[PDB]
């Protein structure tokens, strides 16, 4: 079982702008990439996740850095980022689009490009495809129940959530930090994620994540020639701080264990569905 | 190779989509031989003179390699019925080009009664009468999708076309395909790529799931083909 | 004393038939041009369906000019329900229709190129045409959502709006299209004026002459007030063809004051730009000159457009179940008419369409008469016919 | 014989329709043995007592002859999955009762997200998981069609149930069935019986042909079943 | 093959009320039965066709005797008579409904009654099923072409269309009578009638038609026990004038020749559809 | 010191669970009645769908009371768009709701008959229930279109007018139903008053007591003015059950002024007919008496009904996309609430439903406390619980 798919280099990195770091989940790689492209004419639009005061997510095309800043942080709830990909190249008029999405949404983008039936003049305009790691998603009302009725903190007063370290973590604006075992957070997950076998967004230009890298830092896979040229251009400009993933802890060994834990667990779900007669992607 | 564009009960939009390869249409036409296309070439002209009349017919030539059949078949018109069986007889590979030929498309709503042929009421995809080898959905399929099918057919890329060769055996499409085969089957994760593929904008992402405005759906099949939890061949995981 | 039948005619859209009665010298004495394309029957299946489905469905009349029917459909539903589209939506709508006419006319010049363009100039001529069409299709892509079947054309105006960036792009694309149009027009006008094909055969001076009037309501868009739709009466094929030919025709026979009328570029150029030439060559010339008129009006709409102005009306789609709304639009082929009556629930209770080529088919039948039958098809193509359109 | 009413993700309306045999429901219940029905009988009670808990469970009994399975299967609820396989295990004849069990019906529109089980978003007809022997479409099937099915099952009228035993293999239904299989196939003659059968009044006869108001269709299957150009076994031609 | 199906007797007959004969097509059998049943409580509602001043038909639940008179006569155009059968027993509240229809619409009625899935509380309320003979139907705009363009009579000036004798006959309100070879009418007929194998309405309680009997009279098949009781009740009440089909000409030999002609012609179409792969009822 | 779990509970609609904490003598100390029925999720898939689809869809909450959800839906959409149904349509709608309650109450008396009706009287008792139900379902067939899921219940009123024939048939059947109601009522009220089951078991005098108030807006139909919906708050099952029990509950927990409330026949009979008895037998008694109230109001409506009066409002379904329409209806089980927000195009933008038994479920949890657990199921059935309704 391969753990990461194809990639050129694995890196632990972080954004150089302090504004980004104050607003980002981990190392601010997505926001850093989007803002750099926009500011340097590499991109003219980017798909982002806008969040309502109560953490509801709405897809949006972005043409201003402020917009990118207005939407930095992880909402552990389903946001259809690819639903706006055509709108981006039509009315918005983008020709150098940036797209972000969980590994699945990246899979949708790659198929969307190879068989562009309903995507006339879309594929050529995709200028950078950023993938974020993902283990499991949740319906909004499911995450609402965990945070509010299992963790005490009310959604509005939530400021940052994070899974790992053995369980779920909700960080309150006011200052408290609550944790509940990850074993109780299972009943409320999107069950269509139990057939997903991509952890590190193996088909993105650039994949970025939290695990394997310390707090405030992001594990960054560089996969495609396009992602490499973009990633390098940022480094030569000083938009990123870069350390080898070997020199950093916990390191790639953690990504590998979480990735192959997802794959081995969900591959057994796939075989269970096949066994009882339910459809599985092929 | 020899290719021909058969126009049944369509609107020529699929042909225009191919024409929207723009200046690359010369590279496509220069890579094959356009042997028949009523919209483009005067083929195959055959003059039959009796003592009463001169009949100048443009007929479908024999030994066609790839037939791009566009439109549906009208069961009550004999010339339509005849052209579809001729396309299969004379062509080695029949491509159901466009939703009309592949799944019926807009013509599924036909119920006839209009002048000046009020008995014209029954339109079927070409798969309901002849064997189809490849099917391109959408209304119309994108110029980029067409180029890939043409390039894959010239180059014998069997793997790429497998998804379309599998579609040829499917003669019915709807926006309900997403419900019946994805949402109802605990496979939808809410990317929204389906909503972007629709040419009539009939799909609307609501709470991370597709909602199909069924009265705007023209049964084109672009969303069913797009959704990556239906078909996802290993071929797609290939990038550099 | 013989019958010449050409079937199907070629290098136009769709499926027709020429049935000619010629004398011994080949001169057409009685002409008949008729559609034999099956009747998909849009005016009859739309009844019972919601109004917003009309511009989606009628757009499938034809893939060359889909915008013209979408435009005419919503204008007819807006008229039936007393809906007024906002200024900037009406400007984008017109821009979308002009973008469509910006690819149709070069496309037609490409179809007729085997007859008029020398073979050595073919590749460059096709390249220039396709460069023009790419700009035209991009305008329909940006404004309409799709080039072929534009889903933004809605009852109320235009669904989406464009960014100043996009507007600025189209304005620059239009200036380059205007360059290509001058190149194209400086090349073809001499050929059309010579009246000789590329193989050397000279065309008769009176080629395609006829005695009928014209119908055009606007130079670039459409104006329902310039026509008295009560004087428009549709007759049957039995009223223009011989009985054995009439049963084959799929189209109706539209008349204004009980007379055939020609529509199309020359119809518009006659009414608005004092163009008075008759025949088939004048038809190719007016179409070629109209390319400059379109692109100029496109840049004139962009200079007038407010990219942040409202595009969709907030009025609801409610009719009284009686008013026969009128929706006219100057398609690339000519005066295009849709009519629809809508009930209180926004549903279609009657629908009818009189497409441009529907007007010209019976005019073409007469225009081929008087000249040899080997020139008949050249008279047909001068009318840029679209048959799946004329049949709907 | 032993019959049982299994209630999955349904509305009980199918059971109420059987109750709408009125006083003849006692002639039905006396010709068979109602061995299980949570709505009606306290079966099959099994008491397990530990030192901390008394577990009074009503389980589906063994040796069921005919199982009237009503409602669809929720793929994310484990008790729903367990009960549908339990019904196939313990029943000789499995009847997909109602459109929900037969073709999904109204639950085809479910897309989850509602409290207090927001992961419940995938509903399938029982045919997508177990083997179905007979299927009754409609929402609900009329009491008369039920009486006829039960009588034919008890009397071994295999000929009468053939059309229903054929439906058991069909897990999808829609008003489009009339278009795809009749109107588009030059079979529709304009009776209008398909319009009279529709429980939601979604079919409207316009100019001698049906028009489906697709947003008012619950995918029940009654119209597709009634149409005489689809199925017309000779059995119908018998009159006295 | 068999030509008429099951019947008890076959008799030439016509109504006794001559108001009926003023308005009917042939013998006035349908209206006579409806009006008799209504007047004598055997029927409380009857499905009839309300034609339009341009002969556009409309199905209708009639309850009053005079209504029955406004639907008398043949409109050789499709009329969905069965489409109102439920509305007849719901809001209209009928319990002794009479239904009329071509053999195909009677077939639908018999299936409607045997598999009443969508027809709750309907079968038991059908009191009389009257079938009318039928050879071929037409779309309205098809018949409009036959009458207006081949017979030169405006649908408005149309009075009584009829077929037979080898041609279609249009009788004008103003006196003229036109005839065109049936050959000309065949291109306009609804192509779904070419799979119909029922000429004499073989599944109706009572079937009545024009062929076989003389002008002003009607061939009447009495088939079921229900139809026999209704028919006998009318003859003892004097509502019908009755003569044996053997003493009347052309007689049962014409119906037979026409019934089998249809069967052999269309059975070929059925076998042609099977051959090329189209669906055919079974 | 023991837990008692009954699962599933029987002779009510749907799928529930009893989870009781009982002392060493079997007396319930902490009660838990909860739905485990899967959540089909109507309020969430209706968003995005047209308004006229609501009464069709929400009718499928349940086949026993579908008329109550169709009525509440159209009332909520009419409230959201300021549509006023015509006088005679509102009468037919109320009649359709009353005919539906005329089948439910006898049905429930049939469900509980194995506990209360002697085995020798069973057949004749059931025959009388089914004779009554037939009449109630006939009223729903005639007026509503179908007895199970009435499609005539529409936004704007009722789709179809009946005939004077149909009206008179119903009035005569209502006179016969009233005769059956007296026979039934005179037979059951003495049984319910005895507090002894059919096997001789005496039920505790305080069986099913509780401390909560009632909600009832009308005796036979509904009145949105008689409740302040702002004071109605839905809470989560964690706020009433233990955590290991809460995660299994499928319903929400409605409260009025932060308190649980009982709905249903006794709730109605307390407000409108000064019925003050507590406990579970009072519920069976109130439900039995309401049968006479219903059929007597049905004949009062028929007397008032104008068979030829308009039944559908001509107003269009157009909302402002903000107003939260309120639709209440006294279902057979009690106050049934639906809410809807409608946009300008007639599409649902938000939908919510607080069904009757959704109210009664957390009340049953408390009502079973204090008495032995062998009586818990008899307390449940006194509330005629419909669970597929309470879950939707
Ligand atoms: C449901 C979910 C589960 C995840 N699980 C894991 C995990 O198990 N392990 C792990 O290492 N990482 C996981 N991630 C990713 C992780 O939480 C961070 O988003 C990422 O690792 C670092 O982001 P960043 O700081 O580099 O960029 P940032 O500057 O923080 O910006 C984050 C970007 O992500 C986008 N985004 C936010 N929410 C969503 C969403 N729901 N869907 C799509 N796009 C979104 C926003 O548009 C934003 O631009 C998950 C993310 C999601 C949404
Ligand atoms: C399309 C068509 C084709 C026919 N072909 C033949 C034929 O080939 N040979 C033959 O012998 N008879 C044929 N008939 C029947 C014949 O024309 C007479 O209708 C028949 O004799 C019964 O008329 P009557 O005088 O007995 O009844 P009347 O008292 O005249 O009443 C006639 C009844 O016919 C009903 N009706 C009229 N039009 C329709 C319609 N479109 N659909 C359903 N019901 C309708 C009216 O509601 C009315 O109740 C045909 C009828 C139709 C509609
Ligand atoms: N131009 C054009 Fe169409 Ni294809 C034609 N003819 C019209 O409205
Ligand atoms: N009565 C009732 Fe339903 Ni089946 C419940 N509980 C509601 O509106
Ligand atoms: S686990 Fe897979 S399917 Fe689920 S949200 Fe993450 S990437 Fe998508
Ligand atoms: S698929 Fe669409 S574009 Fe192609 S022929 Fe059919 S209607 Fe025209
Ligand atoms: S929903 Fe859209 S993409 Fe899918 S079949 Fe319908 S029209 Fe085509
Ligand atoms: S493309 Fe497939 S997985 Fe993505 S939102 Fe649409 S149906 Fe769901
Ligand atoms: S088929 Fe209809 S009546 Fe039967 S359970 Fe499903 S929703 Fe209820
Ligand atoms: S059209 Fe009516 S009868 Fe047919 S499937 Fe839909 S709801 Fe059922
Ligand atoms: S039941 Fe069948 S034949 Fe009759 S109208 Fe409906 S689809 Fe046509
Ligand atoms: S020929 Fe048959 S299918 Fe056609 S109208 Fe007559 S009875 Fe019906
Ligand atoms: S199949 Fe019927 S609307 Fe989709
Ligand atoms: Fe027309
Ligand atoms: Fe709720």
Author numbering:
A (entry chain F), E (entry chain B): 1 to 282
B (entry chain E), D (entry chain C): 2 to 241
C (entry chain D), F (entry chain A): 2 to 393
Q: What does the literature reporting this entry say, word for word?
A:
FRHs catalyze the reversible H2 oxidation coupled to the reduction of coenzyme F420 (8‐hydroxy‐5‐deazaflavin, ΔG°′ = −10 kJ mol−1). The overall reaction requires three components: the large subunit (FRHA) that harbors the [NiFe] center and oxidizes H2, and the small subunit (FRHG), which contains three [4Fe–4S] clusters to transfer electrons to the flavin adenine dinucleotide (FAD) located in the F420‐reducing module (FRHB, harboring an additional [4Fe–4S] cluster). FRHABG dimerizes and forms dodecameric assemblies of about 16 nm in diameter with a spherical shape and a hollow core. Here, by characterizing the native hydrogenase from the marine methanogen Methanothermococcus thermolithotrophicus (belonging to the Methanococcales order), we provided an unprecedented functional understanding of this enzyme via a synergistic approach of biochemistry, X‐ray crystallography, and spectroscopy.
Despite its sequence conservation with the two other structural homologs, we found that the [NiFe]‐containing FRH from M. thermolithotrophicus (MtFRH) exhibits a dynamic equilibrium between a dodecameric and dimeric state in solution, as highlighted by size exclusion chromatography and native polyacrylamide gel electrophoresis (PAGE). It was therefore not surprising to observe several crystalline forms containing either a dodecameric cubic organization (MtFRHcube) or only a single FRH dimer (MtFRHdimer1 −3). In crystallo spectroscopy on hydrogenases was recently established to verify the redox state of the active site in crystal structures and was applied to the MtFRHdimer3 due to the abundance of crystalline material and the attainable crystal size. RR spectroscopy on MtFRH crystals confirmed the presence of oxidized [4Fe–4S] and [2Fe–2S] clusters. The overall intensity of the Fe–S bands and observation of [2Fe–2S]+ specific signals indicate a more oxidized electron transfer (ET) chain in the as‐isolated state compared to MbFRH. Moreover, IR and RR spectroscopy confirmed the presence of the Nia‐S state, previously observed in MbFRH. This state was postulated to be mandatory for the thermodynamically favorable binding of H2 and corroborated the vacant position observed in the crystal structure. IR spectra recorded at different temperatures and exposure to intense illumination did not significantly impact the spectroscopic pattern, excluding temperature‐dependent shifts of the redox state equilibria or the presence of a light‐sensitive species, as observed recently in other hydrogenases. In comparison to known and well‐characterized [NiFe]‐hydrogenases, the crystals turned out to be mostly redox‐inert.
